[PDB]
Design a protein around this ligand. Structure first.
Ligand SMILES: OC[C@H]1O[C@@H](O[C@@H]2[C@@H](O)[C@H](O[C@@H]3[C@@H](O)[C@H](n4cc(COCc5ccccc5)nn4)O[C@H](CO)[C@H]3O)O[C@H](CO)[C@H]2O)[C@H](O)[C@@H](O)[C@@H]1O
Ligand SMILES: OC[C@H]1O[C@@H](O[C@@H]2[C@@H](O)[C@H](O[C@@H]3[C@@H](O)[C@H](O)O[C@H](CO)[C@H]3O)O[C@H](CO)[C@H]2O)[C@H](O)[C@@H](O)[C@@H]1O
Length: 434
């Protein structure tokens, strides 16, 4: 049963409970365990392990949260036990689609079949749960003025995740984005993710401006609130909780759910539940795997308990595309033109028909540098500044390298692929006459 968590929907720039019609405010906390050859995932999935999640939900109940942010799940595992247990306490989940080893690389951005398959796998694993609030299609991909050209790839991912969900039988769970708070890029990022024909469904900011006993005016919260007034999609703090002054008083919570900010922001999520040698936890898991409550816990609890955001209703709220930021060198370099939807069938054709292949199972930079001096690699390049995306730039890195290696076609016709490496092999399927 999911009776205590009706699905949340979006109308305009606010979240609403689909049954009651009351505005939904996120009162959240991040919930994600870390690890301190390859028979286990690098990330830990607490929502796939009942002994972990059922230990912590009682403490999450005491905190008074209605939402968790989860950064990584293992889509091959079941999550029904933990998601139902969360639902029984009225708790929702915001979930990143990416994971540390399968994300849009801000240093070399691509939007390809490998990353898209990850996103699809998470969507298909988690979309049956009414308490899945929303998906993040990226987290702080562009994070300063040197990598703004990564953002078109994130917008493509938003578009394609939304389209995949639309064409599925699933509930149309919204897909948004989580950004950082770099002064020189933040305004352009916010506009970019609602500009043109593709829009984020909601916008999370990882917000650490309020440290210690600050105020609405002095923290920067007032200027942020004025900046986001009239923003066309729901906006909230996807992280908060500056730890400069400890124990964290969390007095930002009073501002966030007060009358000035509650008309603009849809709440936020504290970072985070677990203490991981970083002074950001509200609990520490001891050597006996038990929960030890830390000094921050009582302050966050008291602040969430006192918070009482005066929202509006769905019916009372109900009673011209925005221009993308212009390009300026060294400032904003995200083209409005987005890469195409990654095509698994076209890229799977390369696995079938190419004479020379390379298995995945340092070498990429060396072999791309080598091969792209011998053949034209334009067809696998993707440029988010200029909006030029090669025909096969949506294929996996190994497919891309295999294409260039095959482009063999020297013309010896002797099944000897022109690259010395154990991962290189001649594909016998290429001989069989998409
Ligand atoms: O796309 C982009 C990239 O994404 C990286 O992967 C990120 C990965 O870096 C990110 O890590 C977050 C991480 O960003 C987040 N976090 C929060 C904090 C608190 O920050 C305090 C702080 C705040 C401001 C200033 C100083 C300090 N520190 N880390 O913590 C959670 C849980 O502990 C981590 O899962 O999680 C995302 C979702 O799983 C991944 O997509 C990739 O590794 C990579 O190649 C790819 O360029
Ligand atoms: O500079 C790049 C960096 O920006 C970070 O966001 C900053 C905030 O960290 C900063 O917060 C200040 C507090 O640290 C300080 O104690 O109080 C003052 C107000 O009295 C705060 O301004 O504020 C600036 C301007 O709003 C933000 O840009 C990002 O979190 C980080 O991702 C980025 O690398």
């Amino acid at each position: 049963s999911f009776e205590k968590t009706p699905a949340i929907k979006i109308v305009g720039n606010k979240f609403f409970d689909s049954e009651s019609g009351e505005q939904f405010f996120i009162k959240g906390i991040a919930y994600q365990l870390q690890r301190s050859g390859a028979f286990e995932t690098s990330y830990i999935d607490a929502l796939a392990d009942p002994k972990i999640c059922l230990r912590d939900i009682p403490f999450l109940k005491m905190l008074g949260v209605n939402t968790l942010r989860v950064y990584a799940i293992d889509p091959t595992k079941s999550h029904d036990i933990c998601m139902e247990a969360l639902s029984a306490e009225g708790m929702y989940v915001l979930l990143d689609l990416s994971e540390p080893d399968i994300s849009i690389n801000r240093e070399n951005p691509s939007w390809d079949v490998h990353i898209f398959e990850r996103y699809k796998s998470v969507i298909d694993a988690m979309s049956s749960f009414p308490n899945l609030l929303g998906y993040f299609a990226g987290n702080e991909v562009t994070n300063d003025h040197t990598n703004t050209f990564a953002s078109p790839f994130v917008k493509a991912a938003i578009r394609d995740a939304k389209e995949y969900i639309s064409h599925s039988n699933h509930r149309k769970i919204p897909v948004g984005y989580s950004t950082n708070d770099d002064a020189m890029t933040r305004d352009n990022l916010a506009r970019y993710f609602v500009c043109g024909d593709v829009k984020a469904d909601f916008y999370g900011i990882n917000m650490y401006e309020w440290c210690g006993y600050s105020t609405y005016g002095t923290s920067g919260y007032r200027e942020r609130t004025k900046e986001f007034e009239g923003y066309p999609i729901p906006v909230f703090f996807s992280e908060f909780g500056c730890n400069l002054v400890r124990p964290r008083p969390f007095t930002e919570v009073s501002a966030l759910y007060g009358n000035k900010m509650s008309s603009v922001w849809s709440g936020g999520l504290a970072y985070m539940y677990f203490e991981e040698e970083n002074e950001y936890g509200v609990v520490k898991i001891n050597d006996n795997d038990g929960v030890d409550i830390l000094p921050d816990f009582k302050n966050l609890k008291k602040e969430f308990a006192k918070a009482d955001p005066k929202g509006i209703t769905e019916e009372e709220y109900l009673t011209e595309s925005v221009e993308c930021p212009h390009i300026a060198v060294g400032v904003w370099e995200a083209n409005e033109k987005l890469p195409e939807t990654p095509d698994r069938s076209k890229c799977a054709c390369l696995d079938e028909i190419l004479p020379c292949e390379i298995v995945p199972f340092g070498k990429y930079e060396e072999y791309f540098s080598y091969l792209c001096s011998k053949v034209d690699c334009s067809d696998i390049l993707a440029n988010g500044k200029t909006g030029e995306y090669g025909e096969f730039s949506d294929c996996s890195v190994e497919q891309k390298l295999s294409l260039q290696l095959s482009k063999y076609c020297i013309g010896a016709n002797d099944r000897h692929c022109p690259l010395n490496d154990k991962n290189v092999y001649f594909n016998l399927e290429s001989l069989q006459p998409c």
